[model samples]
Target: MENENKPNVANFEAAVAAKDYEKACSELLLILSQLDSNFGGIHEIEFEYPAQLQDLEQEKIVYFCTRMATAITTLFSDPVLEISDLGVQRFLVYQRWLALIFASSPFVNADHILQTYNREPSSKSSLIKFCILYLPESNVNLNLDVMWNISPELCASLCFALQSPRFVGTSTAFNKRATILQWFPRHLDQLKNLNNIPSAISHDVYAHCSYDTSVNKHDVKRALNHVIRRHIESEYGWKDRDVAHIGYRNNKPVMVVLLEHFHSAHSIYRTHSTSMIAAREHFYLIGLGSPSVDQAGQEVFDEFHLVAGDNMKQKLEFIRSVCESNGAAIFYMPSIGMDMTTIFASNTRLAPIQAIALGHPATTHSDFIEYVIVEDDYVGSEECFSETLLRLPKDALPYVPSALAPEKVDYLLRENPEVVNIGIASTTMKLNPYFLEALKAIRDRAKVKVHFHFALGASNGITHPYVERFIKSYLGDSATAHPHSPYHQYLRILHNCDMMVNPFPFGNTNGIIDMVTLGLVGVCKTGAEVHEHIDEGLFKRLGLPEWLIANTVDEYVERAVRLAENHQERLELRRYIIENNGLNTLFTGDPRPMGQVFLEKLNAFLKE
Candidate 1:
């Protein structure tokens, strides 16, 4: 049977070498059929090479690859592709041939094929899509370079496709679901090259960005300004002539007298003005602040009346009109503003403001935003957004380290050294009704005593009455829930724990990172949405597998219990982590040499 297939293989190779695509396609299909049924495996079967072709070109390579892609798609879609005992092996062997042909093609361009398909009226190429889509899932185990090298452009295209609103949910073609946001780390190097910011600053901006964009707008703005000011001072010494004048718009009195400036006796130079200030030809304004929510605590709707109230609305509108009047001037947001861009878009007010995405939530309102402040790994070129991403150097932002305090309360079962402490540092909102049941199951199944510690928000004890009730009813005396503590105190709490069990759908990313940094075994389950897998993403970024990651609540409980019972194994894993503190610990390692490449692009945009 193997000898019989030799002529077919030879003929297919000849067809490819002869530039006979039609013959090649037919011969490949015939070979696929035989391979699909033959339990006798094929040996060292390399696909026909294009190198031997007399007049080889990129186009010929692309044509040949497309034919191969189409052939595989047909085979997979064929109803006659049987699945018997030996059938599974044959199918895998057939897949091996497909992979071989792809791997052998030197000039194959995944993006080129995608572009050709995209030009067609009905552009749907399942084979290429599947190949690229599965990369992330397989990336965990596969070599990163190998996974991406197969078709970097194809992966890039897929990243763009995933960002579309239509690409989400089970209703899409291929019936597959994945979030492109998770693949950020895979393309970090690619992104780092696109912009000209220091990698350190870039990582700082992305890492320090609060998950909740609405929280503490004033502080966020200050931090953003501080970063910029520091950058400006370091790069270009602050000159006295860099002074900004605060004159009222509408040719009226300056509405508010706010003397805001960075004071330094040595430099003899400073920034002086209100929220909106002049930086050379450009103007800076902090986007809509927190008080923007309405009476029902929802985003404001009326364009004339802002969320902060009518007075605040009038003030902003007045400022906006002033900026509009001065056509040459610009209005930029140092940090992201809550639904602030929406108001401008709704009213058709001033020119699109220069917006910086200090928080991930800001990306949600891409329609109103123009510019985004991102780290190399956070945002991709294909991520569907209106804002032009401004990537900073890796670790551009400072690392907010968490260290345990010397004297802190430990609720762990210290009496029993065998007891495994599972800490849940997530907020109350992430706790689903099934949380109690999972905890109960862990306690019942685990061999050793398991104690759970939950971190509650400050002043949330009274507000989150249901949490209190649930803990009392289900966890009883086995769990201890306390209000939020400062960074040092919080670290102390996590330091005492043996394992960190993350809440499903909304894991506390910072808390989990802290736990893992302190050598605690951090366990989390993958989630449906991009934001939900915060804890899971940490392990993925570190290129380490956390086997406790579960697909369902029951699986989560089971994995947690299994880890708790296997005390020695957990300790060994902990020891491994302690010995190998991967990368920069809290930071995302040092910046690439070209981290400052983004400055030129940013400067150009500002000039434009």
Candidate 2:
């Protein structure tokens, strides 16, 4: 022991407080080496160490020994210790360790023995242990007065012992409700109680203290109460208005009623209705919102916009309110698609509802409903989701797909003509200020019918407003007299597009796909990385390698003129789209089963 090294606590503390954990860990390694050396490097700890040090140092060695032992115990199990907190207040080490091992563990008795016996050898400590083991020996619940008569530090230790995990489990779980109430009604009326009693702690603090947090538990009662507050005080008028709206909409001659609160709606509807069959259908789609940014680097916390908090009841109520207030009765129709979870979770603290069902199919037309509809397969397993989405029928669903290259468009247009709408963007020159000025100058001097279109990936549609302002402020008012564009009107932009042109940063596949959809054939130049992968992938997938071209500045102009003049090739491209029918997923999806399920469920629920 005399020859073994020792750690300098001061240096360790300074390094940790400075947030230089790397350096602190380095210093900690040396301190750990000293302790390990004393314990025969953690290997020979079971037997031979009696002759390692002087008799006196050997005694104090165990004090430092136990603390170090726990530190090592945690390290091997991937535990992170805040040694710096020991600098702030030494007792916090025991407090934290007590909470972790005692409060969270399955066994209570093991913890009691450790805390009680782990102390300086003395009668005070002995008596402290005795009182904790048999507090009711005096017929007094608060009979630990003998232990409290010791020094404050000793008392702190005794209090820690009593509130340690072993004692907490025994007191809370061992006794029945009446027995616990009889003796220790206000047992936690002391500093010691703060350590063991979980209800007294804040959720945030308690969350950090406990290891397991895979499950979320919120105060549902409080949440329901909060949600109940948002309903109108005068439900009579609103209820009547809702009934009239339903009556006019559903002329099936059924009596429609609107309940103000969820509980009321549930009771009323459940009592009147038979078994809830799938009435209305819904498809829960994950969109641009995701928990990860690039890959493993980003955590859930980084994706802060996902959901707010734990109050699910409140969130559901708020979603209902938003839906009602906005008159957004039909969740998803051909003309509109909304993220119901986002709408609700953003406004209230709740777990986002996974899509589910509202009613049974056959009997739904004659009932009042408050339930949601989910696909039959999605409830029990996670495997069928992607498959279900693949089978959804197209019903004029209004959601944008990540579009791909031009060659695939011929097939997509032919296969799904009505559902697939194409779009196009402006030339690369138009996006750049200098090139834009030159084009306008050339158009004005030549007196040609000049049309301005924006490029993709560059502005991501910011060019709509910026281009408008640019024309008004710089390109002269005459520019607007010809034709100016809105920022993101896909249909209007592609209505009369000639060709897709852009020096896109990530390949101009999306813009090109949009072009083909709107009946405009594209002449793409493989520019830098932008046109290389994205445009190439789409073209390669559709087996149209000839559509991709490479040309210098002069050749592009010549090729464009040639392409514009070739009416036959352009017509063939349009016909190609008619042949494909938009089954080419590069532009849009064919979510048939999901769409069918959604419609089936929605129709039934709405009718009810």
Candidate 3:
């Protein structure tokens, strides 16, 4: 077969152009032989096809040339390029073509074009680059071209479509003339060069912004001010962009203030005067003193009400009235005014205002709500400077993955493939004793063993005590914890164990996504607003409405047993999550299009 048809690059290109992917692949196989002789075996290449093509009026011919290029690089076993390489230019050409194909086709991975362009310089196109640049986004966004073709939600949606049989369908032709509208809303003033935009669109460019950083403080401040001043700067722009960062500006001072969390400062900030105070044109130094939250409570809303300074009093009063209207008490300290109460207020403006208690008053509160005041360890602080503002990345080494029995966790999933129970584990065994009561009630009522997975040394600093207590009290031979035992031995115990439990004190969304990813169900009870985000908000986002809270302890146990005993229902839900959710470790790692969608939402917010 190899002797009969060696690949000709031109012929292969022609086949790809003709959309004879089969022939193109055939030529690829032959090309493999030629490269194989020189390098080593080039056996596999993973490529993603854009779904946007289904709607294209003009079919795009974008090919993932880098996918092929990396294969060639691997074949040549070339030293990883530390600097720029021209041969990589060929890779760009391939990417451009691929992007153009999809661009013409109507599947918008506009950033993919830019990503491929970026890889041209990296002599070795790293896997990191490939995942970021070459891999498919979660789902196709109608408008990802503006923000470098990224959409976190669309990527999330794509993962959903890929996994769900109910969703995978391509119906419509791509819109040919539907160009990315280049509305240069003065925010881009700092960006020197806006590439690829037509002059017609370029006319709207009054300002351009580059990526934000403290180094460009003076420049950024000036540009942001100018941009805000521009709409009337959309004074009618319902968003609170006008009022931001209020602190003394006479001297260039680094304002830093700390509180237990955002709520501490949130109460005062919710007042009308605070909204005016926070929206200062400029303020230096703001900080938040946050408590160590292994599990976060409600978000501190110290700065919520006055996103901009316009509707300050009305908004504040609205929040005050709404809390009262809901039959929710407004417990105010005549002096401090229930510093923490504001963070949990029912109203939208007030809800976010509640974060003040979690933050320091002076540094965090403002009529303008200017400075972000990074709290050292909390979720908001973690997101303040991250690659994506909304989520914690999987690669965040700020914390390490700790557990004694990772292998045992793995075994339970693999060995008991038929079991479909949402796993419950405890983050702090000491903190949540009721979890044991919940488990026992589960056994007593449902006669079903709920799988309970526990974190090792979660709080007591040792897994042994909790395991000893849990097993002894529960009377189950299967209880186990990592840093306590390895897999093979743990399997012996699992045979006797019934179900895995999720950690009760989940500090992050990762734990929730983790349980789901591990092919287990997560049973979450509503408590703190952030903690309950999993079973409440997350499940709704993923379309898994069935996995939500089981009203009482008895109901929780009964459901767990039912799922475990019923193989079909378990498999269906598991598959639903894997397909729809697509392992987003918070929209960064997942290629489904969540990032693209998120970016789109962010951009639309910019328009507002």
Candidate 4:
């Protein structure tokens, strides 16, 4: 075996020096096989190679080998190495293969992995998938102490795989919780014990490790107690007013709830209710103000506190005191602006307890928030300010489709459907100068006669002279502003329109979701702020890179025109979405997973 391997080693060296990657790859594999066969049982064996090969050559060979091994183990029905004694040898090769991947830097091969998988989505790595697939059994054999005893370099290599796109979003069905269940389960007290990676990596691993589905209301109670005992003490100069606020009487927890002041009549009401349901057992639902009415004529705030007004200074203190003294563990604010921010900033005592912001405002006010609930794609390392970010599989609030009737497909496909109806449906906040500029550009550029549907709410009914003047100036008689009714009614009217465009800086997330649900080709411009990335995040979650994600005004107008002029293409795209259940997936999601994740994060935050 040694005599036969000598020539292969020489050839591998020659190929490496010449930078012949394909040739070097073949020779390197042959050599790796020989060495593996010779050292299969020796777990600590290291390869004895020469310096004749260039470093890049070594990197390329190691990368390809690791990738090939991952693919083979991932895809084939029978393990590729199972038919022979080669399974042990291949495993041995992979063990040493870790050194090449992590030696230079953590996630050094991230770009290479992304490039390969992007070029061929079918060839994604199954590192997390395999872990999730066999986790139920592995849970018993796992020994955290022994696991950490593995070389730190190997540990770091394993950790980096957790951050991979395939593992994160691209094609894998595994979410953060599923990944956590396998790799970073809660028994591990601290992440630093796992490896010598950066503190940020440890922080992420720790956050995920905190996910334990077994955690229930009792566990949450215990965590709440732990935080109260540790942080809030009257002995430490804490006021009785502050101490009196812990609303743990009758064995019920006092929760600081940030809900919509309006009821089901509003767009954000569902999200507010979803969080309320999740926290119902754990805390009292203290409404930021009086809640609005539901379809059944039920008032959401009949039992909860209407805790805001000009008397807000006293109201705010009482709410703050209730949270601090009554073992109130969470300020479950699902929305971003309004009462959540105002109420949160009003009290300094509430800072010690968890502020779980689930809405887009959560990200904007992340500095004050300890935990944020977002979709997985929105979790970025660079700009995040929250101590912990818990991403559910999808948005927390399920989208309820509008009940209004949609315009028939026949109407859309009518002979010479000459007049293209473009729509802009959002709050008056989105009707900015840029929005008007894009609207005018598309209307003027479209080859067909274009009509504009301005779906504003009854209150926003061009009441302001400036708004009325602006619409009349460019849109003239071609535009009609429809009063916003129930979402179903609004979407029904929007359904008749040909194309939709989202406003910049603060694009409406719910609006864009509605447009895609109706099978309308929508265009949006992404901004740098975390909240501004809504449309981009939606498309990524839905796996529709083909949708027009515009960055500039010109592109937004161009996409609108393309949809208007290319009628056949538009119809085909709409048909594909309808057939694929794309709309249903976006609008009607199961909120159970998000609920579990929210509880999981709530449980985790209290532990912190």
Candidate 5:
């Protein structure tokens, strides 16, 4: 039914204001069609209805997406503007409405969303954009059957969401991210069943990083080091990523000595640094191209990582060439934050032996990914991942420590010893609804008085008042949201607290390591997922008692309350880590063992 009454933005708003979404959906379809026809810029149209409107808030999403399918039928009119002519401001404008519907309303249908995503499989459109932008956050309703059918399409869609193109400019304020850390393997499982591979393989070892040399040193939008450089400038007083890179200004070692004074560096930068240094000994690593990766290649590709193609056609072609001729081994060094490329790249057999290591510390369900190199400690069971586990002697990728991390780790006990200040050390993303419930539980149960300081990591400015606002909603006056600080300030903030509490489902890894380096230890919960067990493994290695370890959400709250109440135990815990030098396992030399083992695995896979 080509609309004779193809309503404009004014008509659509009137329909929505009247709570006539059926009419609104009817209008949205025509607007989507008209927008695609280049019928001028009505791209700023809003289609929000009150979530409180009767009992139908969640019901409307399906209607909205159903409208999407009708538009898809018209577009498969594959003018593939959905795929062929992507980055059209008009097309993304159409996609923006999909998420906007969810921004005000809640229930999103993942099956329908992925249906829209996989239907075309090779394009940019509204519903596909909804799956990419909203699915990670909506995070429920994953259809394994739908996902099973769309694994390959997911790979194609990932290149755009992760390393999005330049033309995609400030698209919606959509915060695109990777799949649920746990669901990733389920998605990978679909890829594994496909039994996919390139025709040939090679002997060259390759490591890939989505990061590349930034065009500017101070830009927040680029490299990990670039943001860390700025992170240090504002916090640690170190203008350089490498504190030693620039000798002390003038004859003074003022900044030099201060490296320990306010020690802070990017966590990802540390992973890249130590891996790069120890990598050469036996690992034979070079970035497959620009933006040094944990993977190395024969320079077949200059700076190619995945993103959308016209646009992407040759970029992936270059990566394919790197795989066919040069890669006997390909290792993905995941970034500290989120990346869809890590998920996208993990799906294909880019090398004879494809593997991922501790950067993200989760499973790639891809049958193509032969191994997951992990810390001997982080390894709990095969159920965590489908890949063969290559456990490091201790943890892999030795941390060089943040540029300004103090050589000596110590705690700063507050003047009022009676009040226990507990630090919430994980970033905002880790503070899920369950984690917040645990925090509320801990607050309610503790017999002893407790306070909270949120060490929400170094990028708090970028995280904005959203994190602060939500935390305040739950903890209210009992908690304080500490702004992002440099390594030194972070350690100081953490040290003042008697103990820290790890986030759940996906618990703290690097966050706990740095805190322990300063002789601070905290309550952690263990789970079946790879990231969930990270804290339990580290705590066991540190000789922290089992009582400090939590096995469930209830246990997390219980364990945290026990620590707050057990005044003597709290003192003894920090005392034990420092006296035994419990952190030595964490702060030891470069990860040579990880490199040697990686090589050994590469050879083993080749032999098979």
Candidate 6:
């Protein structure tokens, strides 16, 4: 293994001596990679070599880190260099280096790690930027004890930065949860995705720890609780407020709800929230003001504008006191992906009865949440979930599709009568490499005249180029790729197709609705994660579960291929959805029953 690495090591040394630092970093990354460019163009690098730190030169390990650190400073100092592909690649190497440091720290030379950090006092060893971009993980998540145990000062610096920073949107608008491998498998990763790498690599580190993160786990827990207090008491200006807000409605307790945002048609969270609105007259739903950008969407709530100021801590504390003192309800938080002051709010319980919903639809893995509101299908995921399950019954979530404007819209079905046109739609983030391969498999298996149509959502622009390249690389030039279309047009596009393919590991909510509402048959597979079961549940409701639903990836492809080959079955399913109104019946779902069941569960929780 050393001999195999020696040649690249020599090349890396030459690039370093010549001061072509970017090239030097690339060579090191290439040498460290366990995978070559052949697998989706991935170069999965591993920096922690096992030939023992005692046997190897420990000083030179820091020497490589020093080289990477200097490269970062140089890139940050130069405007042109900072914005270039070279910068992105170097930054990629730097993050991989950080992941290595994270994996080996504490067990490593803590002194040397501190030495590298001090070298860039201005950069804070890029610690602030790193903490700001990455999601907070407990000591249990990866061997992160090193961060809290390295030194008191370093631990304070880390917590001060991480405990609460205002959440901001990035330029790329890439999936914050995507790992680095997902972002790459391209040409040095996309330039648009450059800034998002911070969060990306951090997720990879949290998942890739080689040793126990538990050595000082409780110490980290204690540290976190202390910081949580400082922010709540000192920084937030905690105060008590009189309980004038509506906690009771019509002689019954009202449900206090938190959402990611309000009043946006594009926000799926808004769509999820509106299910309660579907029964506005039947259910007592009150807005608890968002922990986010907007205040309220509709005045359906009794109170709002609660968390509107810069001082959210004070606002949250006031609400906390109100809920505990005289408030008569459960706190219903819609999403942990809520990404704002919700973090702190959820951390400190505002109500004894707390539950979360599928607004973002995944196990939060948060113990702070006592129960998860889900449909019967979602209960399957609870084994992996931290919270107990609460269900909304009979096809669960209810949504009445917004009526399209009453006007004539013409769309010509562009195809041969004999050809099967299969459609799929999702944001680039959901369209992962493995799912793309499934589509490719379906394409290969089909002997009939079939064309694959992809309506790739570019997230305004960031994923535009990469998604196109993604399809091309996996499916080859044979498949047709469509940029995301406006709603009516997108429906028209789906209507023109014979079937739809739902992406997995993270399935679609609105995408599935768009397909079924247009009467297109979709193939989906059940998964361990909540998002994966979304499309599966929708199919069960449509009565196509037995035919379209699959349990494995191989079955996911085989099902698509079978449907593509069998024309009669496709027509029958489409008729069941459109003519028989199986799909429309799903959209006409009434939230009152689910809301009633939801209320009952909360009332039951209050019993204890």
Candidate with maximal lDDT: 6
Span of ten consecutive residues with least summed lDDT in model 1 = 266-275
What's the best-to-worst order under TM-score?
Answer: 6, 5, 4, 1, 3, 2
Query: Over all chains combined, what TM-score does candidate 6 have?
Result: 0.62
The C-alpha TM-scores of every prediction are 0.42, 0.26, 0.32, 0.51, 0.56, 0.62
List the global CA lDDT of all models: 0.42, 0.31, 0.31, 0.46, 0.48, 0.51
What is the Cα root-mean-square deviation between model 6 and the actual structure? 14.4
lDDT, candidate 5, residue 566? 78
Candidate number with greatest TM-score? 6
Winner on TM-score between 1 and 5 is 5
Q: Candidate 1's residue-wise lDDT over 1-608, tens digit each?
A: 34444425566666666656555555665665543333212323334555655364333433444455554444433322323323322222233234323322432122333333233463123334344323211221223355457645444333332222110111121121122333433453353121122211222223222222112211222333333334334443322121123333344212211111112210101101111222212222222333332232111111112223353244444445444433312233333332333322222223333344333333423333355545443332324344566655444332333233233333333333566778887654345445556778888878789888876652131122324444656777888776567767777777778787876655555665566567677567665333445355456555445686676788888888877887777777766666664525434333332123333433454466
* Backbone clashes (count) for model 4: 10
Ranking by lDDT: 6, 5, 4, 1, 3, 2
Candidate 4 lDDT by residue in tens digits, 1-608: 44433424345556655655445545545554443344212112223334553454334344433443343223222222112123222222332232222221222222233232233442112222222222111222234344456433333333333421111111111233344345443323233222233222322232222222122201222222222222233213333233223345456555565553346645566454554554455445455544354442133322455554444345555656556654665565555433332423322346344455444332332233566656554443424333466566665556544444354443243334788887777654345455676787888888888888877642221122223444666778878766446766787788788777666645666676667667676677654444456677776555444447776678778887887778787777666555553555555555555446545645555565
lDDT value, residue 577 of candidate 1? 66
The alpha-carbon RMSD values of the candidates against the true structure, listed in the order shown, are 22.5, 26.6, 22.8, 22.1, 15.3, 14.4
- Stretches of model 4 off by over 4 angstroms after superposition: 1-254, 279-288, 291-303, 308-310, 344-347, 356-368, 377-389, 400-411, 458-465, 475-478, 481-495, 513-519, 539-545, 587-608
Alpha carbon deviation, residue 542, candidate 2 (Å): 4.0
TM-score of 2: 0.26
Better of 2 and 3 by TM-score: 3
Write candidate 5's Cα lDDT for 1-608 as tens digits.
Answer: 55446545556646555655356555655665553333222233334545663355234433343444444333333323233123222233344333333232323323344444454434434434444443222443445345446544444233222222111111122123222212322333232221131100000000111111111101211222222223333433321121111121123111000000011244544543454445455433424333333232222122333323332224344444544433325444433123433333443334554566656544444554566666666666666566787766665556554446566644664443677889878654355555776787888888877889888752222122334545666778778888667767877887778888877756776777766777776888876655767788778777778888878778788878888887777777777876775556665655666557655655565456
Under the 3 Å rule for N, CA and C atoms, how many clashes does model 5 have?
16
How much is 369 displaced in model 1, in angstroms? 1.4
Off by over 4 Å in 1: 1-310, 318-353, 356-362, 370-398, 402-417, 434-441, 444-448, 459-461, 486-489, 528-530, 540-544, 548-555, 582-585, 588-608
